[PDB]
Design an enzyme around this catalytic site. Structure first.
Site, PDB file in Angstrom:
ATOM      1  N   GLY A  18      -7.571 -10.931  21.100  1.00 39.30           N
ATOM      2  CA  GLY A  18      -6.421 -11.033  20.207  1.00 39.30           C
ATOM      3  C   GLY A  18      -5.751 -12.388  20.358  1.00 39.30           C
ATOM      4  O   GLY A  18      -6.151 -13.185  21.214  1.00 39.30           O
ATOM      5  N   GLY A  21       1.294 -16.229  18.370  1.00 41.71           N
ATOM      6  CA  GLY A  21       1.817 -17.516  17.954  1.00 41.71           C
ATOM      7  C   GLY A  21       1.707 -18.546  19.057  1.00 41.71           C
ATOM      8  O   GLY A  21       1.848 -19.737  18.804  1.00 41.71           O
ATOM      9  N   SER A  23      -0.539 -17.666  22.248  1.00 41.35           N
ATOM     10  CA  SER A  23      -1.540 -17.345  23.271  1.00 41.35           C
ATOM     11  C   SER A  23      -2.795 -16.752  22.659  1.00 41.35           C
ATOM     12  O   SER A  23      -2.742 -16.207  21.531  1.00 41.35           O
ATOM     13  CB  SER A  23      -0.984 -16.303  24.249  1.00 41.35           C
ATOM     14  OG  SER A  23       0.208 -16.784  24.864  1.00 41.35           O
ATOM     15  N   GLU A  24      -3.893 -16.832  23.406  1.00 44.65           N
ATOM     16  CA  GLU A  24      -5.110 -16.063  23.100  1.00 44.65           C
ATOM     17  C   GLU A  24      -5.288 -15.104  24.239  1.00 44.65           C
ATOM     18  O   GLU A  24      -4.993 -15.437  25.387  1.00 44.65           O
ATOM     19  CB  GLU A  24      -6.369 -16.929  23.073  1.00 44.65           C
ATOM     20  CG  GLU A  24      -6.114 -18.366  22.955  1.00 44.65           C
ATOM     21  CD  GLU A  24      -7.347 -19.228  22.824  1.00 44.65           C
ATOM     22  OE1 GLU A  24      -7.220 -20.265  22.158  1.00 44.65           O
ATOM     23  OE2 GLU A  24      -8.417 -18.934  23.398  1.00 44.65           O
ATOM     24  N   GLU A  93      -3.403  -6.070  33.005  1.00 46.01           N
ATOM     25  CA  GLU A  93      -4.160  -4.862  32.719  1.00 46.01           C
ATOM     26  C   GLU A  93      -4.811  -4.945  31.318  1.00 46.01           C
ATOM     27  O   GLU A  93      -4.138  -5.220  30.302  1.00 46.01           O
ATOM     28  CB  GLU A  93      -3.225  -3.663  32.823  1.00 46.01           C
ATOM     29  CG  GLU A  93      -3.887  -2.383  32.472  1.00 46.01           C
ATOM     30  CD  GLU A  93      -2.923  -1.196  32.520  1.00 46.01           C
ATOM     31  OE1 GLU A  93      -3.317  -0.168  31.935  1.00 46.01           O
ATOM     32  OE2 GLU A  93      -1.818  -1.285  33.131  1.00 46.01           O
ATOM     33  N   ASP A 138      11.548  -7.603  23.375  1.00 43.06           N
ATOM     34  CA  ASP A 138      10.636  -8.007  22.302  1.00 43.06           C
ATOM     35  C   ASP A 138       9.786  -6.810  21.840  1.00 43.06           C
ATOM     36  O   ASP A 138       8.582  -6.924  21.645  1.00 43.06           O
ATOM     37  CB  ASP A 138       9.757  -9.174  22.806  1.00 43.06           C
ATOM     38  CG  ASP A 138       8.908  -9.818  21.713  1.00 43.06           C
ATOM     39  OD1 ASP A 138       7.821 -10.328  22.059  1.00 43.06           O
ATOM     40  OD2 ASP A 138       9.332  -9.831  20.536  1.00 43.06           O
ATOM     41  N   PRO A 141       5.533  -4.137  16.875  1.00 44.76           N
ATOM     42  CA  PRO A 141       4.221  -3.472  16.804  1.00 44.76           C
ATOM     43  C   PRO A 141       3.094  -4.132  17.633  1.00 44.76           C
ATOM     44  O   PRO A 141       2.254  -3.426  18.180  1.00 44.76           O
ATOM     45  CB  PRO A 141       3.896  -3.513  15.309  1.00 44.76           C
ATOM     46  CG  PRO A 141       5.271  -3.524  14.642  1.00 44.76           C
ATOM     47  CD  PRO A 141       6.077  -4.449  15.534  1.00 44.76           C
ATOM     48  N   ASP A 156       4.421  -6.775  27.725  1.00 47.50           N
ATOM     49  CA  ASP A 156       5.194  -8.031  27.537  1.00 47.50           C
ATOM     50  C   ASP A 156       6.687  -7.802  27.598  1.00 47.50           C
ATOM     51  O   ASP A 156       7.423  -8.123  26.657  1.00 47.50           O
ATOM     52  CB  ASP A 156       4.769  -8.756  26.245  1.00 47.50           C
ATOM     53  CG  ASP A 156       3.277  -9.132  26.259  1.00 47.50           C
ATOM     54  OD1 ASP A 156       2.717  -9.302  27.371  1.00 47.50           O
ATOM     55  OD2 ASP A 156       2.665  -9.270  25.171  1.00 47.50           O
TER      56      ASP A 156
HETATM   57  N1  LIG Z   1      -3.309  -6.275  27.864  1.00 44.04           N
HETATM   58  C1  LIG Z   1      -3.964  -6.385  26.687  1.00 44.04           C
HETATM   59  N2  LIG Z   1      -5.122  -5.745  26.445  1.00 44.04           N
HETATM   60  C2  LIG Z   1      -5.786  -5.902  25.270  1.00 44.04           C
HETATM   61  N3  LIG Z   1      -5.353  -6.665  24.225  1.00 44.04           N
HETATM   62  C3  LIG Z   1      -4.196  -7.363  24.358  1.00 44.04           C
HETATM   63  C4  LIG Z   1      -3.440  -7.258  25.606  1.00 44.04           C
HETATM   64  N4  LIG Z   1      -2.344  -8.041  25.457  1.00 44.04           N
HETATM   65  C5  LIG Z   1      -2.378  -8.597  24.217  1.00 44.04           C
HETATM   66  N5  LIG Z   1      -3.493  -8.188  23.567  1.00 44.04           N
HETATM   67  C6  LIG Z   1      -3.905  -8.616  22.207  1.00 44.04           C
HETATM   68  O1  LIG Z   1      -3.569 -10.002  22.083  1.00 44.04           O
HETATM   69  C7  LIG Z   1      -2.683 -10.207  20.994  1.00 44.04           C
HETATM   70  C8  LIG Z   1      -1.749 -11.358  21.350  1.00 44.04           C
HETATM   71  O2  LIG Z   1      -0.834 -10.968  22.379  1.00 44.04           O
HETATM   72  P1  LIG Z   1       0.477 -11.855  22.534  1.00 44.04           P
HETATM   73  O3  LIG Z   1       0.029 -13.222  22.946  1.00 44.04           O
HETATM   74  O4  LIG Z   1       1.393 -11.097  23.469  1.00 44.04           O
HETATM   75  O5  LIG Z   1       1.005 -11.897  21.012  1.00 44.04           O
HETATM   76  P2  LIG Z   1       2.243 -11.076  20.369  1.00 44.04           P
HETATM   77  O6  LIG Z   1       3.475 -11.907  20.705  1.00 44.04           O
HETATM   78  O7  LIG Z   1       1.952 -11.097  18.909  1.00 44.04           O
HETATM   79  O8  LIG Z   1       2.347  -9.724  21.043  1.00 44.04           O
HETATM   80  C9  LIG Z   1      -1.985  -8.872  20.887  1.00 44.04           C
HETATM   81  O9  LIG Z   1      -1.419  -8.621  19.601  1.00 44.04           O
HETATM   82  C10 LIG Z   1      -3.097  -7.901  21.151  1.00 44.04           C
HETATM   83  O10 LIG Z   1      -3.964  -7.851  19.999  1.00 44.04           O
HETATM   84 MG   LIG Z   2       1.016 -15.282  21.427  1.00 46.03          MG
HETATM   85 MG   LIG Z   3       4.284  -7.439  15.703  1.00 47.25          MG
HETATM   86 MG   LIG Z   4       2.536  -9.470  23.160  1.00 44.70          MG
END
Ligand SMILES: Nc1ncnc2c1ncn2[C@@H]1O[C@H](COP(=O)(O)OP(=O)(O)O)[C@@H](O)[C@H]1O
Ligand SMILES: [Mg+2]
Ligand SMILES: [Mg+2]
Ligand SMILES: [Mg+2]
Ligand SMILES: [Mg+2]
Length: 271
Positions: A18, A21, A23-24, A93, A138, A141, A156
């Site tokens: 995933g 804005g 991070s990956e 996790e 924060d 969804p 988060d």
């Molecule tokens: N612990 C996790 N396990 C699996 N997928 C995750 C995890 N954390 C985040 N993701 C995936 O990575 C995407 C980006 O996370 P993040 O950088 O926190 O963006 P956002 O601010 O949109 O939540 C998430 O929307 C989700 O699809």
């Molecule tokens: Mg991000």
């Molecule tokens: Mg959202």
């Molecule tokens: Mg997040």
């Protein structure tokens, strides 16, 4: 610019899970503890941008480490030296599943019972957090996932516009009732398919959180009860004093409705 295959000689990255804005997020094998983890890394396309690099570091030192079945654990933070420069990350996790953002986009509104169940489980995560002195701040969804075994995972926590509370929008103090309101935004969206407020800009959406009443969910989508209207709209009350005061109270009302009992929230009339 791409993300390396390994981080700190310990994490071997696999499939991308995933992005957001900043991070990956990648599935990684932790070679030291024989564990699959999710590694959140500063975006490769943004990693040399000072604003994003510094924000990533400022947020990593605040990302809360909580221990609860409904909360994504945070295991560690680090930074890899790549030939393009430092690449900071956070190890957490791994959830094999989908975010609520994913679900609403691909499947539309959830059945009301399922929306209620998922949001009720999210309340338990928030309750645990609050008891431990951590406001989430924060709730949205993309920060809530349902795993392939149907477990709710909230992630988060603790890092300070569709999901902003009025108080966040105004820059006033935020407390547990802020999380209640933002979770109300998420509930509204999984129920109707839309967030309560949309607009041209972030500032227009913030303005609506502050000054305008949400349209009752039952008016936005078929098959939603007045009892559900009452719960959603209480969570979304403008004044923190008129919302549920705790995640636990919100959950209690969701449970009532799940069991076809009347919620304690003020009734809402339409038509
Ligand atoms: N612990 C996790 N396990 C699996 N997928 C995750 C995890 N954390 C985040 N993701 C995936 O990575 C995407 C980006 O996370 P993040 O950088 O926190 O963006 P956002 O601010 O949109 O939540 C998430 O929307 C989700 O699809
Ligand atoms: Mg991000
Ligand atoms: Mg959202
Ligand atoms: Mg997040
Ligand atoms: Mg609870």
């Amino acid at each position: 610019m791409t993300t390396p295959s390994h981080l700190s000689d310990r994490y071997e990255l696999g499939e991308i899970l995933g992005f957001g804005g900043m991070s990956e997020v990648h599935l990684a094998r932790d070679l030291r503890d024989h564990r699959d983890v999710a590694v959140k890394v500063l975006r490769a396309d943004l990693a040399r941008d000072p604003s994003f690099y510094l924000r990533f570091r400022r947020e990593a030192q605040n990302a809360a480490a909580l221990n609860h079945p409904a909360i994504v654990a945070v295991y560690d933070t680090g930074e890899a030296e790549t030939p393009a420069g430092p690449l900071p990350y956070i190890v957490m996790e791994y959830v094999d599943g989908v975010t609520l953002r994913d679900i609403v986009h691909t499947e539309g509104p959830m059945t009301p019972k399922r929306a209620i169940e998922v949001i009720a489980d999210a309340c338990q995560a928030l309750n645990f957090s609050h008891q431990n002195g951590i406001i989430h701040r924060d709730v949205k969804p993309a920060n809530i996932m349902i795993s392939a075994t149907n477990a709710v995972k909230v992630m988060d926590f603790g890092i300070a516009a569709q999901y902003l509370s009025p108080e966040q929008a105004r820059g006033d103090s935020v407390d547990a009732r802020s999380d209640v309101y933002s979770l109300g935004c998420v509930l509204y969206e999984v129920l109707t398919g839309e967030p309560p407020f949309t607009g041209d800009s972030p500032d227009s959406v913030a303005y609506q959180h502050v000054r305008e009443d949400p349209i009752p969910p039952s008016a936005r989508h078929e098959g939603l009860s007045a009892d559900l209207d009452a719960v959603v709209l209480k969570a979304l009350a403008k004044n923190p004093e008129n919302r549920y005061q705790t995640a636990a109270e919100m959950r209690a009302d969701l449970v009532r409705v799940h069991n076809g009992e009347p919620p304690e929230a003020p009734k809402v009339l339409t038509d």
